[PDB]
Homo-oligomer: 460 residues x 2
């Protein structure tokens, strides 16, 4: 035998990144040819260049990439054949590659771990047939081990994350406690690394698909909630945002369990997130309450159908939205003044999210939302600042669906003159928003409009 | 209790329906007292009155009802103690009642089987603790046995139906193949009775809550789909409607498995349903496609978020709506001409469902829907028949959300004059719908309106 084998491989792997066209081309031609020539040996040789910390970063990433593109594809059908092509190679050549990949975890210095993707690619194919019985225990160990380094834990958590989102939820339900233990471990308040924390929280979000049994146990649930709430306090905003994302999904998945955390934690955290000057954070706060509105609206319909059938509803609402109303609305109307200057009305910022939330809130809380919004409207409807003038018009249009029509009509009649005047406003943004609101009126309250105004062809 | 006592029980039971107040009064006083006095024997004596084909219909029904109201209640808490009180009676007395109830199946002549309700009440209490291990096999046999009569099969299927909707889905997953076998059996295209078919199809609908394992098996799924599709061809409309209802639910529960049946059966069946003069049938067809639009819209968002995260979506859409568009739209716009003379205060008829479907279709297929709708609009916008004139206005308003704005603006500009004129149309219906569409415009395309229309206060 001769090491020339791996030597040349590493030379070509480094050319797939060459500024030259010829080398880059010849590089891929060779690689592809070697795959065809003898894949099992090809992948074993690549898993060796990857697991070798002595090799240059470029060579190791290029090696991971090749291993990656051998087990997965953007095409569900192609990806399906690769997994069969992989299961095709004899167990021996595979245990070799699987071990090298797992041994690469923690031996990488570059940011994105190329080993984690490879673990996921192989797990997706072997786990469904119980071919990698030592993967989970290994991964869990890598995280719970006190001597494990940041890279070791971070890369392992990334791998758990990929697995949670690439594998069929039913395939993981059987190993939920293990995976969750590793995930929760990486999220403990005492974690020294913000990168480890981020990787763990991102993975939790993906695991919410198969951890029902875990959330149904009032004992574990308390811990998961404590760890997630603490993560919302982390100084690294990426961790904070990922934590909020979990609360957002958990709220729409376990509304009945939230009464224990709502008043003690959730309320203060999300309300504070809605007030953040950081957009990614504020959006997360707004979605949280948007979800509560969806949930409580469904429950109201449940209570209704149950009544008409002469019985108590199976589930009841704790009316979180109605209770938060006085704190939510001021925050939302103020966010309305943070509208974008341009017509990129396809960009999703707090201002647009807030507007949507105010409407959900109106259809959810109905008659109650009006008392909270009117003051802001009457106060800014005629404000010199277009940002407030616009927000006022927007807010008025946001409450037209939900409240009792008989309570809105007088508001409409009393405001129409201003609206008609606002259609000629100096600001383009105010004009458009006003057309929107009049539209909401002619649309939800035709009578109040039809009679307090008739249409007439314009003149340009 | 001797023959004489049993005879008075039957006399009392027949009085609970007496035109007299005293008798009906005394009757329930006695029955309740007998329950208190000695429940176990009261229930055994009632199950004997019910099981006896010789007893008058009134007495057998009154007996079933007494047995029913002793095991269930509309109050979840009271219902809970009744089930505990029943489990309290010694197995011997219960086995007697259970046997008499099961023996009543098929021995009834009257329409609603009172025995099936009693089977359900007992099953809900005993199944959760594995106390009636011979119930399922018995029921299955009652249906699959070739010599079984119509009433035998019909009453048994109703009982299976009640169980499917009264018992916790988790409690039935373990006996899914059995229940499904009996259900599918009652639905075989060769079934002589339309009443048996209806009872079986209604039962399938209820079982969709716990038969996931059954649908995940490519083998059984083929059969379930075959039997449900055949049922949609039954000459008895009730069966037809129930079958369609199943397809509707199955579509929203198993979109990923539909590719095998969509082209071969589903497409032609539902499209034909949409064209029916029978409203209950047409609604079912429209709901089917409304569901497909919901499903594919969610998938589109899934593909989007997956892209922004640099990866292939876990699930992909087959774009059924886009493909059916040229067949769907013409049937929908035609249904818009079937509007009720201004609803009995918002009834849910084909016309209103169709309008909703057109909207979903527009946001789902965007750009593409316009070419399909415009012709209808331009052709009927000025039609002497208000039904078509209104439909044209409605259709124009239905496509404003979804297609590209720059593609709609010119259409609005070109149509506004007619819309403003339509606001003064002789027909109330036309006027109302027109107000809605202009609202949709003022709402979705502010600029195209703000510069082309004027609101003038009514000086009237």
């Amino acid at each position: 035998p001769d090491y020339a084998s791996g030597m040349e491989l590493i030379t070509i792997l480094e050319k797939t990144v060459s500024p030259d066209r010829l080398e880059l081309e010849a590089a891929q031609k060779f690689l592809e040819r070697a795959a065809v020539e003898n894949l099992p040996t090809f992948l074993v040789e690549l898993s060796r260049v990857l697991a070798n910390p002595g090799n240059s970063q470029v060579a190791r990433v290029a090696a991971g990439l090749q291993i990656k593109n051998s087990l997965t594809s953007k095409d569900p059908d192609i990806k399906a054949q690769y997994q069969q092509r992989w299961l095709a190679i004899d167990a021996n050549a595979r245990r070799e590659v699987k071990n090298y990949v797992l041994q690469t975890l923690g031996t990488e210095t570059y940011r994105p771990s190329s080993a984690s993707q490879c673990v996921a690619g192989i797990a997706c194919a072997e786990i469904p047939v119980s071919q990698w019985p030592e993967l989970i225990p290994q991964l869990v160990a890598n995280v719970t081990n006190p001597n494990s380094t940041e890279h070791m834990k971070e890369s392992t958590l990334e791998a758990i994350g990929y697995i949670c989102q690439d594998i069929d939820p039913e395939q993981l339900q059987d190993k939920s406690n293990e995976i969750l233990t590793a995930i929760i471990q990486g999220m403990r308040k005492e974690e020294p690394s913000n990168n480890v924390k981020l990787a763990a929280t991102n993975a939790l979000l993906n695991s919410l698909e198969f951890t029902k049994a875990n959330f149904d146990k009032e004992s574990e649930r308390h811990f998961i909630m404590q760890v997630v709430c603490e993560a919302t306090q982390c100084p690294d905003t990426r961790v904070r945002v990922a934590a909020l994302q979990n609360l957002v999904k958990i709220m729409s998945l376990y509304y009945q369990y939230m009464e224990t955390y709502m008043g003690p934690a959730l309320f203060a955290i999300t309300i504070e997130a809605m007030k953040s000057d950081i957009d990614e954070v504020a959006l997360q706060g707004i979605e949280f309450w948007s979800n509560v509105c969806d949930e409580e609206m469904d429950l109201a319909i449940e209570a209704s159908e149950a009544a008409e059938q002469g019985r108590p509803p199976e589930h009841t609402s704790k009316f979180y939205a109605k209770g938060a109303l006085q704190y939510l609305v001021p925050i939302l109307t103020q966010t309305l003044t943070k509208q974008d200057e341009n017509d990129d009305d396809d960009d999703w910022n707090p201002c647009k999210a807030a507007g949507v939330c105010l409407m959900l809130l109106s259809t959810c809380c109905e008659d109650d939302i009006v008392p909270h919004v009117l003051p802001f409207i009457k106060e800014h409807i005629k404000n010199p600042d277009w940002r407030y003038r616009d927000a006022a018009v927007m807010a008025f249009g946001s409450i037209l669906e939900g409240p009792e029509p008989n309570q809105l009509k007088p508001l409409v009649i009393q405001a129409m003159p201003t609206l008609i005047e606002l259609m000629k406003d100096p600001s383009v943004v105010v004009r458009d928003t006003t057309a929107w609101t009049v539209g909401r009126i002619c649309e939800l309250l035709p009578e109040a409009a039809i009679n307090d105004v008739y249409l007439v062809p314009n003149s340009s």
